[PDB]
């Protein structure tokens, strides 16, 4: 019973299909992992009866298997090394549950729809960092990072940079000093905002990703936004949560991202990677690693998580398929098959 910390990633260079869960009626799945177990979280099918539930990863989500953590139309989960944090929203209120007990709450700031990262959150020591957001998807939507300690909200972090619209952030650790997040951006652009959160200084900054590979959906053709790294290109309306994990090697940080194949519908799902660099100021295209999901199959939301091995962490990306969950992980080397 000791706090988790970011650790260097398990050796490997590629991703492969790891596990598929394909049948309760659930939506918007995610996975979160503690020191020795992974849980598959989803919301049980906006509506007062919606709930945040979980089953052990590898189980089929059924009523017999599922534990109901809290009422919620949206939510997240974390593990700080001593216990699980369950977070969710049902104006709107955000509730935080630690282990068995309800602890703090947070009220919509925008007095508008409140949502959180639909993903595992990121804990260092006993401090869990959660992205929350509100103001409506149709316009300006501001995100904040809540620093949660044993279920209590101790600090609210207001970001600088491009903050007019940040939603559904997929976060992971780049290093022991920082959390980075690949965010959704409705209304304004095909480029995902990228958040850098300094955990030593509890300071966040957001800039638009510079890469010419557009990651949100719908998107214009890659390389087709003749503007400075910061500009908003076409097809801003719509959008979807992207997968994103870090590969922390002793000397380099790899960054893995998901994208749909469709520039229109949410169809298929591809995997992209870049090693090293600094996305806020780096226009180079991401390398294509392979196809996680075929174009004839649904491919909606995707998320990152990391599996804890005994002495390293394994980056993994999950994909929602309207909904079944496919898991891909950084195991070994070679092409994704």
């Amino acid at each position, epitope marked *: 019973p000791e706090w988790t910390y970011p650790r260097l990633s398990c050796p490997g260079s590629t991703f492969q299909k790891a596990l598929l869960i394909s049948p309760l009626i659930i939506r918007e799945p995610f996975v979160a992992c503690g020191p020795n177990e992974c849980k598959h979280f989803a919301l049980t099918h906006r509506n007062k009866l919606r709930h945040l539930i979980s089953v052990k990863l590898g189980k089929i989500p059924t009523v017999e298997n599922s534990i109901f953590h809290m009422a919620a139309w949206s939510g997240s989960a974390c593990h700080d090394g001593k216990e699980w944090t369950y977070i969710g929203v049902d104006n709107a209120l955000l509730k935080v549950k630690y282990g068995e007990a309800y602890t703090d709450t947070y009220h919509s700031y925008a007095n508008n729809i409140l949502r959180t990262q639909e993903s595992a959150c990121n804990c260092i020591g006993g401090n869990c960092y959660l992205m929350i957001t509100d103001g409506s998807a149709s316009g300006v939507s501001e995100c904040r990072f809540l620093k949660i300690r044993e279920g209590r909200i101790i600090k609210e972090i207001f970001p*600088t940079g491009r903050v*007019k619209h940040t939603e559904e952030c997929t976060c992971g650790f780049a290093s022991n000093k920082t959390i980075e997040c690949a965010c959704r951006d409705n209304r304004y652009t095909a480029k995902r905002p990228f958040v850098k959160l300094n955990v030593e200084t509890d300071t966040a900054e957001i800039r638009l990703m510079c890469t010419d590979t557009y990651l949100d959906t719908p998107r214009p053709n890659d390389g087709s936004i003749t503007g400075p790294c910061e500009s908003d290109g076409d097809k801003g309306s719509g959008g979807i949560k992207g997968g994103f994990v870090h590969q922390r090697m002793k000397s380099k940080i790899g960054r893995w991202y998901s994208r749909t194949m469709s520039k229109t519908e949410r169809m298929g799902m591809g995997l992209y990677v870049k090693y090293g660099g600094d996305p806020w100021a780096d*226009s180079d295209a991401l390398a294509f690693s392979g196809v996680m999901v075929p174009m004839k199959e649904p491919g909606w939301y995707s998320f990152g998580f990391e599996i804890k091995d005994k002495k390293c962490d394994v980056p993994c990306i999950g994909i929602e398929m309207v909904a079944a969950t496919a898991i891909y992980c950084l195991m070994g080397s070679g092409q994704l098959l």
Partner: antibody, heavy 121, light 107 residues
């Protein structure tokens, strides 16, 4: 369209507060960034920062510990606040406006006149 | 940040002469390099947008071009009204940094 006003003198450790009045346009317009450029005597230009009505805000990282910019839409104006002014901060402070037109293709099309601020005991 | 250098820092040129000013970025800035004309006592006036394009109202004597790291501004015919200090900045990644600029003296 842009005009600076405020103290022409602060002493070390004091906060400098300069306000740029906007006319012939509006700070409430989401298509523009408003901001400040510094020019120390005998030197070239240093960018300080810029803000938008949409909430976006950027600052020069070497300064972004001591600076805040406020877009005061109700009075159609904006201001620069610099804490702990020490000495090397003596400069002409200019306000400027940057449209995000076409696709963010422009850099400060409109400029103010500038206000020279001396830092002294 | 991206450090930008301008050269020559001081320029002596005649009326009717041709002026070339070069900006050297330490990192690629794609094609987003802006140029300004600062007459002493005045706020800098924008001349150039995306390396070229040319700001409306600029006398057509001015034109820029370039890509990546090395860019130039030229004045097709130098006139006394072109006496100014000229500056350029990265206009891609944030922390827009200006070089020292150049002084253009007209003789």
């Amino acid at each position: 369209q842009l005009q600076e006003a405020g103290p022409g003198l602060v002493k070390p450790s004091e906060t400098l507060s300069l306000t740029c009045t906007v006319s012939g346009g509006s700070v409430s317009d989401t298509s523009y960034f408003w901001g400040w450029i510094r020019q120390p005597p005998g030197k070239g230009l240093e960018w300080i920062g810029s803000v938008s009505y949409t909430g976006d805000n950027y600052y020069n990282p070497s300064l972004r510990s001591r600076v805040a910019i406020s877009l005061d839409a109700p009075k159609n104006r904006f201001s620069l606040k610099l804490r702990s002014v020490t000495a090397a901060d003596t400069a002409v402070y200019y306000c400027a406006r940057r449209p995000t037109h076409f696709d963010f293709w422009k850099t400060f099309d409109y400029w103010g006149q500038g206000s020279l601020v001396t830092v002294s005991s | 940040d991206i450090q930008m250098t301008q050269s020559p820092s001081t320029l002596s040129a005649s009326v009717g002469d041709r002026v070339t000013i070069t900006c050297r970025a330490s990192q690629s800035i794609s094609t987003w390099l802006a140029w300004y004309q600062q007459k002493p006592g005045e706020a800098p006036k924008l001349l150039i947008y995306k390396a070229s394009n040319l700001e409306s109202g600029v006398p057509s004597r001015f034109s820029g071009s370039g890509s990546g790291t090395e860019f130039t501004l030229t004045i097709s015919s130098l006139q006394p009204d072109d006496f100014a200090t000229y500056y350029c900045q990265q206009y891609n990644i944030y922390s827009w940094t200006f070089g020292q600029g150049t002084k253009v003296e007209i003789k």
